[PDB]
Protein backbone atom coordinates (compact mmCIF):
# COMPACT_ATOMS: atom_id res chain seq x y z
CA UNK A 1 0.00 0.00 0.00
CA UNK A 2 2.55 2.49 -1.37
CA UNK A 3 3.51 4.57 1.60
CA UNK A 4 5.06 7.99 1.41
CA UNK A 5 6.52 7.57 4.88
CA UNK A 6 7.76 4.76 7.11
CA UNK A 7 8.10 4.14 10.82
CA UNK A 8 11.48 2.53 11.29
CA UNK A 9 13.56 1.63 14.30
CA UNK A 10 16.59 3.88 14.71
CA UNK A 11 20.03 2.33 14.90
CA UNK A 12 21.62 5.55 16.11
CA UNK A 13 21.00 9.19 16.97
CA UNK A 14 18.90 10.69 14.19
CA UNK A 15 18.12 14.36 13.85
CA UNK A 16 15.37 16.07 11.96
CA UNK A 17 16.02 16.18 8.23
CA UNK A 18 18.82 13.61 8.31
CA UNK A 19 19.17 11.38 5.30
CA UNK A 20 18.80 7.77 6.26
CA UNK A 21 20.15 4.44 5.06
CA UNK A 22 20.32 0.93 6.34
CA UNK A 23 22.31 0.29 9.45
CA UNK A 24 23.11 -2.93 11.18
CA UNK A 25 20.39 -5.52 11.77
CA UNK A 26 17.85 -3.61 9.67
CA UNK A 27 18.00 -0.46 11.77
CA UNK A 28 18.01 3.04 10.25
CA UNK A 29 21.04 5.28 10.46
CA UNK A 30 22.17 8.73 9.21
CA UNK A 31 24.22 8.86 6.03
CA UNK A 32 26.18 11.37 4.04
CA UNK A 33 26.55 9.15 0.99
CA UNK A 34 23.84 9.51 -1.73
CA UNK A 35 22.67 6.21 -3.24
CA UNK A 36 22.52 4.70 0.24
CA UNK A 37 19.77 7.18 1.02
CA UNK A 38 16.26 5.78 1.03
CA UNK A 39 14.58 8.58 2.93
CA UNK A 40 14.94 11.21 5.59
CA UNK A 41 13.79 11.79 9.10
CA UNK A 42 11.10 14.20 10.08
CA UNK A 43 11.56 13.27 13.74
CA UNK A 44 14.41 13.15 16.21
CA UNK A 45 15.27 9.80 17.80
CA UNK A 46 17.81 8.42 20.28
CA UNK A 47 18.64 4.77 19.65
CA UNK A 48 16.21 1.89 19.34
CA UNK A 49 13.38 4.38 19.17
CA UNK A 50 11.09 4.50 16.21
CA UNK A 51 11.53 7.36 13.82
CA UNK A 52 9.22 8.59 11.15
CA UNK A 53 10.90 9.11 7.87
CA UNK A 54 9.79 10.13 4.43
CA UNK A 55 10.88 8.03 1.76
CA UNK A 56 12.93 9.66 -0.99
CA UNK B 1 12.71 3.14 -8.52
CA UNK B 2 16.08 1.43 -8.89
CA UNK B 3 19.04 1.81 -6.57
CA UNK B 4 21.97 3.16 -8.68
CA UNK B 5 21.05 5.11 -11.93
CA UNK B 6 24.27 4.04 -13.69
CA UNK B 7 25.07 7.03 -15.77
CA UNK B 8 27.12 6.69 -18.97
CA UNK B 9 30.34 8.43 -20.04
CA UNK B 10 28.52 10.93 -22.23
CA UNK B 11 26.35 12.05 -19.24
CA UNK B 12 29.50 13.67 -17.75
CA UNK B 13 29.00 17.11 -19.11
CA UNK B 14 32.46 18.60 -18.49
CA UNK B 15 34.45 15.63 -19.62
CA UNK B 16 36.92 16.32 -22.42
CA UNK B 17 37.10 14.46 -25.73
CA UNK B 18 40.30 12.55 -24.85
CA UNK B 19 39.03 12.14 -21.29
CA UNK B 20 35.88 10.34 -22.46
CA UNK B 21 37.89 8.15 -24.84
CA UNK B 22 40.15 7.11 -21.94
CA UNK B 23 37.24 6.43 -19.58
CA UNK B 24 35.73 4.07 -22.16
CA UNK B 25 38.96 2.24 -22.88
CA UNK B 26 39.38 -1.29 -21.54
CA UNK B 27 43.11 -2.04 -21.70
CA UNK B 28 46.49 -0.30 -21.29
CA UNK B 29 47.24 -0.80 -25.00
CA UNK B 30 44.04 1.03 -25.86
CA UNK B 31 45.02 3.83 -23.52
CA UNK B 32 48.45 4.15 -25.12
CA UNK B 33 46.84 4.35 -28.58
CA UNK B 34 44.80 7.34 -27.38
CA UNK B 35 47.57 9.18 -25.50
CA UNK B 36 50.67 8.78 -27.69
CA UNK B 37 50.39 10.48 -31.07
CA UNK B 38 53.98 10.10 -32.28
CA UNK B 39 54.05 6.69 -33.94
CA UNK B 40 57.76 6.14 -33.25
CA UNK B 41 57.39 6.96 -29.57
CA UNK B 42 54.28 4.72 -29.38
CA UNK B 43 56.28 1.90 -30.96
CA UNK B 44 59.05 2.27 -28.33
CA UNK B 45 56.54 2.26 -25.47
CA UNK B 46 54.86 -0.84 -26.97
CA UNK B 47 58.31 -2.52 -27.18
CA UNK B 48 57.72 -3.14 -30.92
CA UNK B 49 59.91 -1.10 -33.27
CA UNK B 50 60.66 -1.45 -36.97
CA UNK B 51 63.97 -0.32 -38.46
CA UNK B 52 62.16 2.90 -39.55
CA UNK B 53 60.86 3.45 -36.01
CA UNK B 54 64.41 2.90 -34.68
CA UNK B 55 65.93 5.42 -37.13
CA UNK B 56 63.25 7.95 -36.26
UniProtKB/Swiss-Prot annotation, chain A:
Keywords: Host-virus interaction, Late protein, Viral attachment to host cell, Virion, Virus entry into host cell. Disulfide bonds: none annotated. GO terms for cellular component: viral capsid, fiber; viral procapsid. It is found in: Virion. Its main location: virion. One of its GO terms (molecular function) is identical protein binding. GO terms for biological process: symbiont entry into host cell; virion attachment to host cell. Belongs to the phi29likevirus major capsid fiber protein family. Protein that forms the 55 capsid fibers. These fibers are not always present and may have been lost in some lab strains. They may enhance the attachment of the virions onto the host cell wall. Homotrimer. Forms a super helix coiled coil in the homotrimer. This is Capsid fiber protein. It comes from Bacillus phage phi29. The chain holds residues 58 to 113 of 280 of the full protein.
Curated annotation (Swiss-Prot), chain B:
It comes from Bacillus phage phi29 (Bacteriophage phi-29). Disulfide bonds: none annotated. Homotrimer. Forms a super helix coiled coil in the homotrimer. Belongs to the phi29likevirus major capsid fiber protein family. It is found in: Virion. This is Capsid fiber protein. Protein that forms the 55 capsid fibers. These fibers are not always present and may have been lost in some lab strains. They may enhance the attachment of the virions onto the host cell wall.
